[PDB]
Amino acid sequence: CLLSAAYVDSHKWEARDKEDCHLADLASLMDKTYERKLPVSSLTISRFVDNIASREDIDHAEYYLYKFRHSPNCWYLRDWTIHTWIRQCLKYGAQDKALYTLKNKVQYGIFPDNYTFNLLMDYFIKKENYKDALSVVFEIMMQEAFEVPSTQLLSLYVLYHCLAEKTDLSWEEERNFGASLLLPGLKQKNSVGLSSQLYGYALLGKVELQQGLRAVYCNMPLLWQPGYLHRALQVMEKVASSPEDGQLCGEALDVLDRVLKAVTAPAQGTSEEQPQEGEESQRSEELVEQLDVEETEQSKLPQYLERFEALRSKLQALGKVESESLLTLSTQLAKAQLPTCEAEDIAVYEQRLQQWHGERVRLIQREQEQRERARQDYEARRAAKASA
Amino acid sequence: RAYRGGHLTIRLALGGCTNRPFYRIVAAHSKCPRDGRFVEQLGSYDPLPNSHGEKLVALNFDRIRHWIGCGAHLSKPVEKLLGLSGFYPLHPMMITNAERLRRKRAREVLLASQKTD
Amino acid sequence: MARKKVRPRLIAELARRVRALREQRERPRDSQRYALDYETMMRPHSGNRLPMRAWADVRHESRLLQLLNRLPLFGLGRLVTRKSWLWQHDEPCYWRLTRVRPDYAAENLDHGKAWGILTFKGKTESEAREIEQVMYHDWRLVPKHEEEAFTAFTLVPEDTPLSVPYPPLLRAMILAQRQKYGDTSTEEPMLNLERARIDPWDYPAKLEAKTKT
Amino acid sequence: AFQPPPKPVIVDFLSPEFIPPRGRTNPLKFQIERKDMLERRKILHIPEFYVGSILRVTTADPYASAKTSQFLGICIQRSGSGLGATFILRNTIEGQGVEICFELYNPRIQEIQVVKLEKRLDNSLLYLRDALPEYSTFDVNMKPITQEFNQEVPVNQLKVKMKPKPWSKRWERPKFNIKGIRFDLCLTEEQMREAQKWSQPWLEFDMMREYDTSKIEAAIWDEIEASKNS
Ligand SMILES: [Mg+2]
Ligand SMILES: [Mg+2]
Ligand SMILES: [Mg+2]
């Protein structure tokens, strides 16, 4: 949230509105274009979102959002239009419509792969938006826009929520919480990224071990390879070259994984008796993804347990990076690098706004010259009407 | 007759007599009937053996290779006959049918042995 | 053919124009054309029922446009693969998407036509080809963290022989042909396979018009 | 299920039936009839439409397959005073022109929908019977057309062709005062001069046969406003 302190938006946002617009004539014109089924530009939709006056205008802009981009010019949506619409949503609601338009992420599909992802979270933290900001991380992870320095910003909030998470996770929770740490968390400079990867792999392996392999990549942007416990163990094995680790949350979650895999083997009617939906329907539509000699993970539990027990002893014997809590360690590390990333993101944002403004006037000039040449052609033909 | 398309195919026109088949190995259009108009006759095939126990197959290899180079397609029995003659490699369908026949003979021998004791 | 008493038929010519106009004005859009009923496996538009072997992947997988709709720029430079390729070919086979035009008439936006670069069995083609079988329910997407790892392919030279023995009858024909002219060389004739290389059935074909040179 | 973003917005009548006739009928009857017709309009939405506009009417037909019967056509004329106002719709179906005279306040009418609000050059176009079938043919499944209020109901200035004589009426007589018929291609100069013998120029300047209803219309509008506020 410290980014928005030095990234004051009210000063530069009010310097971007140069459209000075209203209602009636262009409302009629575009309703006529879509009565005639004619594609239009994103210049106009940027122009209107540049002149939003109220939340009634926001809802108008939403029903708008919902009756054009099904025209031929769907791909030509400009980037700065997304920023303008996000700023207008922040002007009034800041909390409800932006989340509704992003949770589907395909229905509205703003696709703001820019600094707006960090900006929305920074604005969310002002009210601290506990349940409101949880869903946004899932959609950012789905969009896979982890090129700007947002990794630490999202890792702070997911670790805020993980401590508060004290419940029995369901099938969807074990998938989304596990997937919200590998793609988002990729920092190799600090132990936070490695701990996030170890935590995410452990939770992702539970779905494969309990339900099936297809469900982890049916919708999540994950990999179909059966090896996820091995990916959880390889980051621990990398300790021979990496001196700094988490060694607390990953170990605790691997303890849960090993006790879950150790209680199901002797007791088959205790934990595995949760599948009581249907038998013949599942048998007729059963899918065999793995081969017969593909070394199924179900028979590798004694191997996994020995590897984990051997690695956890050596990590404490040589690494000794056992911290008191991962959240308090990540809080002081993520906020330390925020002043470093603000200075590297300010220049790129300043050039992005300049290039977007340069494209706006180019599109305006294109429309003006097309209109003037159409007028010249119409006047020339009317002066000397020569047809057939 | 006029056709919208089709390709030249070297096939067998079954021109013969009841309970006495006789094939003419001929190159003809794909959309023409079996016993209809053809381009050029190549050879003859007699399914039933003669008094010497021999099955006569006639091949005009000089015209066959010329038409195949021109782009004439071949049918499965045509390929089988060419593989038997040796002008073309043996068709793998013949090999798999021979393997199936050998397996059937082995099964019959096993059944005969188990039905005797 | 050509007679003195040929009647100048006009209704037949006008019917060609009428059918040409109705072909474009009433052109069925690809969305409802490829719409699918997941219960009876029946196409509402054409009325044809899907193959029995395809009943599993339709219910257990997704098509290209059903996964490309959630990407920011409709997958510019992204790599997409197929379940059939992943199963049959251990070597990486992917399409690098360079341009996509989704159909705007679909309410759910899960239909469209895309182009891209084909890299099948590790062989990279230096030409742009239209993507085939978009409506198939076998497409899968690779993540960014695995984009570089999936491209890891090793170039292993082929062990296919370049020459094969001739069939016995043709070999005897060649031996007699050269012997009659008087060539005493008893060298073994071989049939070359340099130009006999053929693509597998899983290799997609191009959908662009062939240019006659 | 993408959201499609259209139009940015970036840019900056008394119905004829309410007119009482010229007779000396007591105003109490007119007031009662106006009250009843306003009560009927409270339930049945009667839109604004002139002569020449195209309407679709839904009627309660018991003997049809469905209880709703749809009829679309152009309004030939509107006539009547008060609750008994009627309008004539004309449409050519399969080469057979059909004209139906509907009542505005008949309870069997389910819905009246104006698909094309458009005026014409004549207050009463009864000549469509003698006109060409092209001017009476209208698609039943046409879509409604919505217009802006600033257009002020544009009037369609269309010259209509005519069938050869005879006609249903003598449309060339001055008593009809028709400008929408292309007479120069259907009648000759001698016929045009002959038709002028029935002209009555004094009726335009009689100054006594005119009907002034300014105060009556004001009172009716006040009553309508009071009923709406009620
Ligand atoms: Mg016979
Ligand atoms: Mg078919
Ligand atoms: Mg009469």
Coordinates of C-alpha atoms in Angstrom, one line a residue, chain C residues 69-164:
Chain C
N69 CA -10.8 -16.3 -24.3
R70 CA -9.3 -15.6 -20.9
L71 CA -5.9 -14.4 -22.2
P72 CA -5.3 -10.6 -22.4
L73 CA -4.4 -10.3 -26.1
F74 CA -6.0 -13.6 -27.2
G75 CA -2.6 -15.4 -27.0
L76 CA -0.1 -13.3 -28.9
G77 CA 3.0 -15.5 -29.1
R78 CA 1.5 -18.2 -26.8
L79 CA 2.1 -21.9 -27.3
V80 CA -0.9 -24.3 -27.5
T81 CA -0.8 -28.1 -27.7
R82 CA -3.3 -31.0 -28.0
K83 CA -4.2 -34.0 -25.9
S84 CA -3.7 -36.3 -28.8
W85 CA -0.3 -34.9 -29.5
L86 CA 0.7 -35.1 -25.8
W87 CA -0.4 -38.8 -25.8
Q88 CA 0.9 -40.1 -29.2
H89 CA 4.1 -37.9 -29.6
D90 CA 6.5 -37.7 -26.7
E91 CA 8.4 -35.0 -28.7
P92 CA 7.0 -31.5 -28.2
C93 CA 4.3 -30.4 -30.8
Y94 CA 2.9 -26.9 -30.3
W95 CA 1.4 -24.0 -32.2
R96 CA 2.7 -20.5 -31.7
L97 CA -0.3 -18.2 -32.1
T98 CA 0.5 -15.0 -34.2
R99 CA -3.1 -13.8 -34.9
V100 CA -6.6 -14.8 -33.8
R101 CA -10.0 -13.6 -35.0
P102 CA -12.7 -14.8 -32.7
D103 CA -16.2 -14.9 -34.0
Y104 CA -18.2 -11.9 -32.5
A105 CA -21.6 -13.6 -32.9
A106 CA -21.0 -16.1 -30.1
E107 CA -22.5 -15.0 -26.8
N108 CA -20.0 -17.0 -24.8
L109 CA -17.1 -16.2 -27.2
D110 CA -15.7 -19.7 -27.7
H111 CA -15.4 -19.9 -31.5
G112 CA -13.1 -18.3 -34.0
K113 CA -10.3 -18.8 -36.5
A114 CA -6.6 -18.5 -35.7
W115 CA -3.3 -18.6 -37.6
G116 CA 0.2 -19.4 -36.3
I117 CA 3.4 -21.2 -36.7
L118 CA 3.5 -25.0 -36.5
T119 CA 6.3 -26.8 -34.7
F120 CA 5.5 -30.5 -34.9
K121 CA 7.9 -33.2 -33.5
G122 CA 10.4 -30.4 -32.9
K123 CA 10.5 -29.3 -36.5
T124 CA 10.0 -25.6 -36.8
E125 CA 8.3 -24.4 -40.0
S126 CA 9.4 -21.0 -41.3
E127 CA 5.9 -20.2 -42.8
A128 CA 2.6 -19.0 -41.4
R129 CA -0.2 -21.6 -41.6
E130 CA -3.8 -21.3 -40.6
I131 CA -4.7 -23.4 -37.5
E132 CA -6.7 -26.5 -38.2
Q133 CA -9.3 -28.3 -36.0
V134 CA -10.0 -25.3 -33.8
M135 CA -13.3 -26.7 -32.7
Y136 CA -11.7 -29.9 -31.4
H137 CA -12.0 -30.6 -27.7
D138 CA -8.4 -31.5 -27.2
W139 CA -6.5 -28.2 -26.9
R140 CA -4.4 -27.5 -23.8
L141 CA -2.3 -24.4 -22.8
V142 CA 1.1 -24.4 -21.3
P143 CA 2.0 -21.9 -18.5
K144 CA 4.7 -19.2 -18.7
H145 CA 7.0 -21.0 -16.2
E146 CA 6.8 -24.1 -18.5
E147 CA 7.0 -22.3 -21.8
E148 CA 10.8 -22.6 -22.0
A149 CA 10.9 -26.1 -20.5
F150 CA 8.3 -27.6 -23.0
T151 CA 10.4 -26.3 -26.0
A152 CA 13.3 -28.4 -24.8
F153 CA 13.8 -30.8 -27.7
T154 CA 16.8 -32.9 -28.8
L155 CA 17.7 -33.3 -32.5
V156 CA 18.3 -37.0 -32.9
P157 CA 19.2 -38.1 -36.5
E158 CA 16.9 -40.6 -38.1
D159 CA 18.0 -44.3 -38.6
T160 CA 15.7 -44.9 -41.6
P161 CA 17.7 -46.6 -44.4
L162 CA 18.1 -44.5 -47.5
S163 CA 18.0 -47.4 -50.0
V164 CA 16.0 -50.6 -50.0

